[PDB]
């Protein structure tokens, strides 16, 4: 029942000092054998234990790390926090919380519940929220009885960007893609739903995009049509 | 102080048991060790710890084919009857002075189907239009192995320029996915009678086209 959860920037500039924290569901961090630990993990790269410490006062330190780092804990809000000084482009990975057990029964020490992680970026680059387009397919792609209607959410940095359809009402036929990383340095990514080809028109379809580091938080409509919008009037067929 | 060795790489087929290793560094034969397993995407699961002498201990919610063995330095992680969702980084970790992880090995799961492709393509929207721009989208999804190349046509001439393209990857339903942008004027998208994404996979194609005189 104990959940843990990360929240920080995700683009911070070299020689700046990061600061994160962990708010806790399901148990107390004033309350038993149990330190209050980060750890990270850079792009593709493994896990690197970074600090610990418990309400009590009592922490510990990666060594390379020690001089670098401060840990509080908020027994009030039931969270705690990490500090990193003089980040460089070193310190760009996944950082998630965790609760370090001490089981009595065997005097061992392990995580037993982590959180699910959050991305920080270390760059000088600036932050470019993207351009939210509709993409509405061809004719002929819908005449099968089933159509894709999406949003491309184009050029922006850093990673990631969330995307939901209707507020989070429409999840089945929804797929997200991976985004793609261009020669720019900039990203994008397509999400799209699968529709009846049929009415359509009785169907409210709206993508909501967030990005986070640029606070680009759009709903876009998506017209329930093809790309040929004007087949109601002129009855044609492309 | 003590360090953990892992191989970073392991593949096993469906169905079977898979070992893996992690090694304990000299004068630290004697340490307990957890294992922690972390799906693509997701913070890692502790799955159990384990003595020297091989005695596993599995946390809440594990399944029962997890268990771990040990021999010498040497801590064994044992998955009995692989499953698909065991696709997976595993690490191992202990404590000394701190806490230490192994490098963790990367576990690919073999034996899933062969299946070819699906492939969409989307034209310019009006309003990328409107901006001066446009962008192709082509979407391949649906399929494995995860080797897929992608071709442009401009009508029937091949396209290089403006094409950014994914590397796949694995996607809830176990199949890879992967995307293909190709970056034209309005001009160019306007002076063609078609654009075309092909996707080859296993020696086999598959294409979709788009016109300017489809849209309106
Ligand atoms: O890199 S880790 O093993 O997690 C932390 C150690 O202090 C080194």
């Known amino acids: 029942q104990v959940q843990l959860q990360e929240s920080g920037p995700g683009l911070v500039k070299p020689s700046e000092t990061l600061s994160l924290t962990c708010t806790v569901s399901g148990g107390s961090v004033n309350t038993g054998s149990y330190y209050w630990s980060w750890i990270r993990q850079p792009p593709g790269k493994g896990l690197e234990w970074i600090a610990y410490?418990?309400?009590?006062?009592?922490?510990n330190y990666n060594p390379s790390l020690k001089s670098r780092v401060t840990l509080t804990v908020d027994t009030s809000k039931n969270q705690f926090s990490l500090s990193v000084r003089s980040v460089t482009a070193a310190d760009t990975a996944v950082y998630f919380c965790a609760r370090l057990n001490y089981d009595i029964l065997t005097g061992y020490y392990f995580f037993d519940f982590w959180g699910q992680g959050t991305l920080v970026i270390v760059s000088s680059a600036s932050t470019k929220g993207p351009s939210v387009f509709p993409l509405a397919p061809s004719s002929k792609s819908a005449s099968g009885g089933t159509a894709a209607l999406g949003c491309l959410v184009k050029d922006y940095f850093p990673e990631p960007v969330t995307v939901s359809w209707n507020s989070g009402a429409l999840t089945s036929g929804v797929h997200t893609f991976p985004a793609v990383l261009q020669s720019s340095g900039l990203y994008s990514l397509s999400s799209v739903v699968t529709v009846p080809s049929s009415s359509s028109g009785t169907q409210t379809y709206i993508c909501n995009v967030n990005h986070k580091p640029s606070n680009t938080k759009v709903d876009k409509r998506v017209e329930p049509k093809s790309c040929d919008k004007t087949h109601h009037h002129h009855h044609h067929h492309h | 102080q003590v360090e953990l060795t892992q191989s970073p790489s392991a593949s096993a087929s469906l169905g079977t048991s898979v070992k893996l290793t992690c090694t304990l560094s000299?004068?630290?034969?004697?340490?307990?060790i957890a294992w922690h397993q972390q799906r693509p995407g997701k913070g890692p699961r502790y799955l159990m710890n384990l003595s020297s002498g091989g005695r596993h201990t599995r946390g809440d919610g594990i399944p029962d084919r997890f268990s771990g063995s040990s021999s010498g330095a040497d801590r064994y992680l044992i998955i009995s009857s692989l499953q698909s969702e065991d696709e997976a980084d595993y690490y191992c970790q202990t404590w000394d002075a701190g806490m230490v992880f192994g490098g963790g090995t990367k576990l690919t799961v073999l034996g899933q189907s062969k299946a070819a492709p699906s492939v969409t393509l989307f034209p310019p929207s009006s309003e990328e239009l409107q901006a001066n721009k446009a962008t192709l989208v082509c979407l391949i999804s649906d399929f494995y192995p995860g080797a897929v190349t992608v071709a442009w046509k401009a009508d029937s001439s091949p396209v290089k320029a403006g094409v950014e393209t994914t590397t796949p990857s694995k996607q809830s339903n176990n199949k890879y996915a992967a995307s293909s942008y190709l970056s034209l004027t309005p001009e160019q998208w306007k002076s063609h009678r078609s654009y075309s994404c092909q996707v080859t996979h296993e020696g086999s194609t598959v294409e979709k086209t788009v016109a300017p005189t489809e849209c309106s």
């Open positions: 410490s418990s309400v009590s006062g009592t922490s």
């Open positions: 000299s004068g630290h034969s004697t340490y307990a």
